[PDB]
Amino acid sequence: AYARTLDRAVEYLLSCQKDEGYWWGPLLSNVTMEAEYVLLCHILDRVDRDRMEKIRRYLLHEQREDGTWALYPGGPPDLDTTIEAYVALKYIGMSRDEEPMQKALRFIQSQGGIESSRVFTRMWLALVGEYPWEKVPMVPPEIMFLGKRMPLNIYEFGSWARATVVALSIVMSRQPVFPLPERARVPELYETDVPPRRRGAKGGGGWIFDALDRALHGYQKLSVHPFRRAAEIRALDWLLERQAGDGSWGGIQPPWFYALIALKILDMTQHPAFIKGWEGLELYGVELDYGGWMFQASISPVWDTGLAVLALRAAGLPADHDRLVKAGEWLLDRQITVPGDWAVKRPNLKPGGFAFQFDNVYYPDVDDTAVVVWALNTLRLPDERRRRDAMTKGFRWIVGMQSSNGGWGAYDVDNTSDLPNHIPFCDFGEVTDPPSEDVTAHVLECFGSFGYDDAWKVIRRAVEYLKREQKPDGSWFGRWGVNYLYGTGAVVSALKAVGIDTREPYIQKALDWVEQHQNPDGGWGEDCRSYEDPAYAGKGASTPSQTAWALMALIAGGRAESEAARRGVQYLVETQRPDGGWDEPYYTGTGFPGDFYLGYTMYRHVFPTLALGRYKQAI
Amino acid sequence: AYARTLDRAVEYLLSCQKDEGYWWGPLLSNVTMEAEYVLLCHILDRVDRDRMEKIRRYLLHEQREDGTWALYPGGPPDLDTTIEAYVALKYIGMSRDEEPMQKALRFIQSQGGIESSRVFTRMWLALVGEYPWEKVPMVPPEIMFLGKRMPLNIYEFGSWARATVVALSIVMSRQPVFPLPERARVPELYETDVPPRRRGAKGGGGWIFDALDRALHGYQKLSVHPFRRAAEIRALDWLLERQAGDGSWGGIQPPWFYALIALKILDMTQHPAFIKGWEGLELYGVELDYGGWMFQASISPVWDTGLAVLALRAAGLPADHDRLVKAGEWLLDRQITVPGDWAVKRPNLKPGGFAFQFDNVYYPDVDDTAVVVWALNTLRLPDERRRRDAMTKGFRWIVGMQSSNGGWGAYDVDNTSDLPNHIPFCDFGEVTDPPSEDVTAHVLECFGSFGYDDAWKVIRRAVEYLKREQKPDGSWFGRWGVNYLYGTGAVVSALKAVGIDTREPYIQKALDWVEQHQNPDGGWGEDCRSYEDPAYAGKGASTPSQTAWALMALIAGGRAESEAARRGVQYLVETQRPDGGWDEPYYTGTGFPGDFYLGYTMYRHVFPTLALGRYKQAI
Ligand SMILES: C=CCN(C)C/C=C/COc1ccc2c(-c3ccc(Br)cc3)coc2c1
Ligand SMILES: C=CCN(C)C/C=C/COc1ccc2c(-c3ccc(Br)cc3)coc2c1
Ligand SMILES: CCCCCCCCOCCOCCOCCOCCO
Ligand SMILES: CCCCCCCCOCCOCCOCCOCCO
């Protein structure tokens, strides 16, 4: 039956593999990437008329009937995203009249205008002079003086927030303004009567931080700021030391852009670091066949490759298939062997992790490292020496990364401070990197492959963590993947792999929850709204990936030979395309719950293949 | 008569001009450049068999009958240079037997062996483990803590020494060893009976520094060096901030190589600065037609271009010649507009200088700046706006650069400390950058072109400086050009340009000295030995450049219509080649008096043309 579905999915995957031996699907997000890019180009005075064009098609192409842009496809209109896209277009050439500009503007006004947008959005506008800097939450260079163990030192922030904070302190230190031509000024963003509905800090704003900010804005007005000169150079040096190989900073859009702006501010346009950071941008860009151009928030080569392998294996290909060897070899050359920001909390821990992107040595993450190591553990490569060795380093590193609650974060250990969540500046996404169910699950499943079972204390401490984090209805939150279907799929699969008994009560209570959300069409789907409103948990249009996730949960829990089970397999078999792939018009990836969603292009092909590969196993 | 010589020389220079509009002659030095390169490659584990070959041909080709290499062509065998070349060859493949290896080896031994070589040479050997680190003068990272105004803070060193000191403190901090294969070990460098004739610090070694070093090597042995971690990072950041656009450091061989080694030491071979620093090297390399390959100690594009223009103008071409405009435009794009290390002593001084090489913004020098500005002053470019403006900036920068004694240094103001000259480490070349007669002269002649005569206090203070520095016999030392013929030529030409009276006693006493050293063959020549033994001052085989220098001195002093005068013109007119150029098998350039000499490839063509252009003027 499905066997053909598999043979067809397999050959399709293999056809997507690049020459070097890896897989690399693009990463989808929202238009703030390209919108901010346009603005960046203006700040750096490096505008390419042809590029703007391609960007205009894209922005428009992405706008909806109502004239707005959302975070995820088929989602509620987003203010910030729409404001930024609006300004972007007006600068590229559009007139506030044109149909699109019209629809958007009205939606923006019906929301309280610019005064209701996240800090970033107001900050960008502040940068081109369309918003007073005084009203933007202040982050001082002096934050660079806080010690390793102090309230709000930069290492109390998540890796992704950290670099941004550093780069920004330099920018906010100078509060520079790069005026836009009159043709693009957007005063109309204020022209509204609706009351400005301000978004506050993630965890609520104590009156302390409120005061402190006003404080800082006042100090900012003084004529002399002693040691500021030094605080800046401190930040700069911090940035210069960490620049990634591709010229980015962390391989993520934000800090990269801010860092570049900051160098511009410091008259360092013709310094090696600036030049490289600038040229690097192109690698993250993508030519859209309909004429547009988009910029990736980040890139997932390693990750894509890692899952690719595992899927193709669980599928059927030989642990030494010459095409998988190409990948295995490639992966080995990726292993990070030098200290990263994580060493600040683990000085005696030997380097051995992996990054998400191509060349980002200071920020390996547990998730990638776990999947990669495990994927390798399933291959037989020529140099069994290096494979054995690689694995062991990565493994040890993963173990040394385990946090205090027996769980695993993504980039740091016990990056669980609560302080950062209350600053006025932090009103978007996550700011800290605490342990999560999905990463912890992936780790356990990694160790699982090696055989380490529930006996080992490390594994237990972790299971205890998961057991305590389970939800009332028996599901598990999905931190980096939409959502409960993603998490529950992870945990169960993991627990199964570490020897735990699939028959336990809590396990059964999870599998039940799964069968319970199967859509009429036989598959499963969970919409990104499930982060904002619970009624959506496990509810949504069926997708190949999410279906594949629920299947893995079922296959692991023994219910492989179920109705719901065989039912979901049908869905995949039917919905598959002639070429072997699958379609998926919905995002199944999560950047920040409720704030930033991602579309992992390869998910639709790899997870269905891995789920099917594992079903063919249960028989 | 000579008119043809000029026409011929002119069209020749014009044929040497690159497309972009500049001139760029190679820079000759000695084999330690290529020898150190070989070693560098070994340290970085990046050896290209093919390149090694090209370097062997070169090394050999440069060796002399006696089996030694000298600093300047036709000079006494140099120990350090020969030791380094020896080791280089042995590593590339030579056997201690072969004729070349034998002759060299014996010369080395007849000198006390390795124990008689400069610090650098022993250090390089220490790096590959052929010499104990304990016996190498120690320079600690902690030097990074001395304040702006303190004994031996890094800004008390000359720009070229500074960067090296920083990069090295990191290296000496770790005292790393990169072993050579047994095949190349050079124990035989010790096998000698002759007493080791040790070279001491430039200005003498007080017993203090002697003790201090011993102190440091002791502290080096401790198990804990508090804050060293930070001293290193201070150095690292200092380097990271100053890397040049081409990836070099200062556009000079030394620090660039050391910095690269230092990054390697810190596991930063995957960092942008290193990759760029590494790829940058190729630009300084040069394919030799006989199969060899050489590496330039530095590059003189700006300088060459600057003089090229002036010569072609004084010769005759129109101030708006389309071919000179190409140059003028090019030069404008070169002006440095950001703070350099010089700002540490001139914070309120506006940037406006120029560098020697292509892209080296933190180290513009007075010499280049003066020649460039002045050369522009002689042109008529399309955008008279930028020309007017640029000049002004440069001018101001030059003025603000004048030191305490009315003289001008090269890179810094009053970089005249005496402390650095006594450290055990500093046994090679110059370590400080004090004012010199030639630079000061070039500056005066620059201003001179504008009009600013002796009235202006600036000019006077300077003339006073020169007047006091003149030698007993009426000559002027040549700091960056071999030597008295170079300096005296500069000064006199300058003084003439600033309105002074060529008839004065001291002026006449100079011109006389000139006429007095004219060689029988009608030309002038001064050998590089004139830095070690006075009997050589103004003595040596005639060269096109030095002849052209003495001519400018004579033409300026009114004695243009002299015997010696017309006599020297003959020399040039005759010795000139059929193509238009001139030959010059001798170095006329000076890096460090008595320690490092340079061959300016373009000198032989430009100065003769400029001297001839100025003779055609006196009629
Ligand atoms: C899929 C598995 C998740 N696991 C953990 C691997 C790591 C993935 C990379 O995680 C991120 C995490 C954050 C980001 C951002 C981003 C976007 C906007 C802001 Br504001 C800040 C960061 C852009 O790309 C990102 C990628
Ligand atoms: C011709 C005019 C001189 N004027 C002033 C312009 C500046 C020229 C650059 O001066 C230098 C000055 C020093 C160096 C070194 C060098 C070589 C060995 C060591 Br050790 C240290 C530096 C290599 O190249 C150099 C070039
Ligand atoms: C000069 C110290 C070299 C020793 C490196 C250990 C650094 C420990 O990391 C602590 C914080 O820095 C995070 C890592 O990325 C650092 C890059 O800087 C490179 C070498 O200092
Ligand atoms: C963050 C301060 C930036 C202002 C620096 C100017 C300081 C005065 O110059 C001191 C000497 O250092 C030379 C500066 O240029 C080198 C690179 O350092 C980068 C920031 O300017």
Swiss-Prot record, chains A, B:
Domain of life, per lineage: Bacteria
Catalytic activity annotation: squalene = hop-22(29)-ene; squalene + H2O = hopan-22-ol
Subcellular location: Cell membrane
Pfam families cross-referenced by the UniProt entry: SQHop_cyclase_C (PF13243), SQHop_cyclase_N (PF13249)
InterPro entries hit by this protein: Hopene-cyclase, SQ_cyclase_C, SQ_cyclase_N, Squalene_cyclase, Terpene_synthase_CS, Terpenoid_cyclase/PrenylTrfase
Keywords from the UniProt entry: Cell membrane, Isomerase, Lyase, Membrane, Repeat
Topology of this chain in the membrane: Peripheral membrane protein
Temperature dependence: Optimum temperature is 60 degrees Celsius.
GO biological process annotation, one example: triterpenoid biosynthetic process
PFTB repeats: 6-47, 52-93, 232-273, 391-432, 459-499, 507-548, 565-613
Activity-pH behavior: Optimum pH is 6.
Residues forming the catalytic site: 367
Pathway as given in its UniProt record: Secondary metabolite biosynthesis; hopanoid biosynthesis
Protein family according to the UniProt entry: Belongs to the terpene cyclase/mutase family.
Function, as annotated: Catalyzes the cyclization of squalene to two pentacyclic triterpenes, hop-22(29)-ene and hopan-22-ol (diplopterol); hopene and hopanol are formed at a constant ratio of 5:1. Is a key enzyme of hopanoid biosynthesis; hopanoids are components of the bacterial cytoplasmic membranes that play a vital role in stabilizing the membranes.
Subunit-level organization: Homodimer.
Protein known as: Squalene--hopene cyclase
Species classification: Bacteria, Bacillati, Bacillota, Bacilli, Bacillales
